[PDB]
Write an enzyme that holds these catalytic residues in place. Structure first.
Site, PDB file in Angstrom:
ATOM      1  N   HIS A   6       0.850  -1.212   0.000  1.00 35.42           N
ATOM      2  CA  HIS A   6       0.000   0.000   0.000  1.00 35.42           C
ATOM      3  C   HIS A   6       0.870   1.241   0.000  1.00 35.42           C
ATOM      4  O   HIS A   6       2.073   1.160   0.189  1.00 35.42           O
ATOM      5  CB  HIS A   6      -0.893   0.016   1.298  1.00 35.42           C
ATOM      6  CG  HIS A   6      -0.098   0.210   2.595  1.00 35.42           C
ATOM      7  ND1 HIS A   6       0.323  -0.829   3.335  1.00 35.42           N
ATOM      8  CD2 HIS A   6       0.253   1.368   3.296  1.00 35.42           C
ATOM      9  CE1 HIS A   6       0.955  -0.373   4.459  1.00 35.42           C
ATOM     10  NE2 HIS A   6       0.886   0.966   4.455  1.00 35.42           N
ATOM     11  N   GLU A  66       0.029  12.005 -11.061  1.00 34.24           N
ATOM     12  CA  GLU A  66       0.099  12.171 -12.542  1.00 34.24           C
ATOM     13  C   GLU A  66      -0.842  11.118 -13.125  1.00 34.24           C
ATOM     14  O   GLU A  66      -0.973  10.013 -12.544  1.00 34.24           O
ATOM     15  CB  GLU A  66       1.566  11.946 -13.063  1.00 34.24           C
ATOM     16  CG  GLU A  66       1.708  11.815 -14.589  1.00 34.24           C
ATOM     17  CD  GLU A  66       3.094  11.257 -15.008  1.00 34.24           C
ATOM     18  OE1 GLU A  66       4.029  11.288 -14.076  1.00 34.24           O
ATOM     19  OE2 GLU A  66       3.207  11.027 -16.262  1.00 34.24           O
ATOM     20  N   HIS A  93       6.506  11.773  -6.822  1.00 27.98           N
ATOM     21  CA  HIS A  93       5.127  11.800  -7.343  1.00 27.98           C
ATOM     22  C   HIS A  93       4.679  10.396  -7.530  1.00 27.98           C
ATOM     23  O   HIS A  93       5.544   9.448  -7.577  1.00 27.98           O
ATOM     24  CB  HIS A  93       4.955  12.720  -8.575  1.00 27.98           C
ATOM     25  CG  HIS A  93       5.627  12.248  -9.841  1.00 27.98           C
ATOM     26  ND1 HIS A  93       6.714  12.887 -10.374  1.00 27.98           N
ATOM     27  CD2 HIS A  93       5.336  11.172 -10.692  1.00 27.98           C
ATOM     28  CE1 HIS A  93       7.084  12.247 -11.525  1.00 27.98           C
ATOM     29  NE2 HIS A  93       6.251  11.197 -11.708  1.00 27.98           N
TER      30      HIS A  93
END
Lengths: 120, 125
Positions: B9, B107, B58
Site C-alpha cells: 500500500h 500524474e 510523485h
C-alpha cells in the site's frame, strides 16, 4: 471511467550511485536505464524512477513471503540500512520511508478494533 | 524467491480526512473500504491507499488514451490544482499533472514503461 493501474513512482535522490546500489543490490530491483541524473528500475512489479537533485508524510509498503521475513530482516541489517523500531520499517539512503509486510493490507484489515467502520 | 513481491500500500498524511475522502473517492473514483479514528483506507487503480490525519516525489496512474479528455475536464471541473507538463503533454494526450488537497503530486499517464524505453545518449541495460 476508472484509473486502471499504478503507472510508476518518482523519488528525488541526492546521489544516484548510492540509490542504484540500494534499489538494485539491496532490494534486488532490475536496472533498466540511466541518464546523468536519472535511473529507472522495475521493483516488486512497479516502475520506479529516480531523479538526482520532510519525509514524515508518506511511506510506500511492499509485500514479502512470510517464510522470507528473517531473510529480509537480516539482509537489511547486514547492509547497514536504517531500520526503525511480521513488519519491517526502514528508510532508503535519502530517508524516503519504506515497509515490508508478510500479509496484505486487506487480510489484515478484516482481522479486533470493534469501533472502526467497514464499508462492504 | 528472494524478491519483494508487490506493492502492499501507500500511505499519505493529510490535514482533513473529509476533504481527502472527497478527492480520492468522489473525484478519482476510488473505493472507500474502512475508516477509523483519524484514518481512512481506499482501493484505487488496484492499489491500497491509507490516509492518516495529521493537523521530491510523485505517484503516476495509467489511463487509456480514449479517457484523457474525460480526466482532464473532470479535474478542471472540480477545481483541482493542475500543474504543467512537457510541451505537447495535453495536446498529444500524454500526461496530466496535479496535486491532492495537501499538495501530494500525482500524474495520469497514457503510456507504459516499455513505451518510454522505446521512445528513448542514454544508457540502456
Amino acid at each position: 471511467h476508472m484509473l486502471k493501474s499504478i503507472n510508476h513512482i518518482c523519488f528525488s535522490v541526492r546521489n544516484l550511485n548510492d540509490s542504484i546500489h540500494f534499489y538494485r543490490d539491496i532490494l534486488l530491483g532490475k536496472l533498466l536505464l540511466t541518464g546523468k541524473k536519472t535511473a529507472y528500475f522495475e521493483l516488486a512489479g512497479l516502475w520506479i524512477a529516480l531523479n538526482e537533485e520532510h519525509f514524515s508524510y508518506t511511506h510506500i509498503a511492499f509485500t514479502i513471503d512470510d517464510s522470507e521475513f528473517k531473510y529480509w530482516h537480516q539482509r537489511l541489517k547486514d547492509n547497514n540500512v536504517n531500520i526503525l523500531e511480521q513488519s519491517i520499517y526502514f528508510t532508503d539512503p535519502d530517508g524516503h520511508k519504506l515497509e515490508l509486510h508478510t500479509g496484505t493490507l486487506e487480510n489484515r484489515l478484516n482481522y479486533a478494533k470493534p469501533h472502526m467502520t467497514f464499508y462492504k
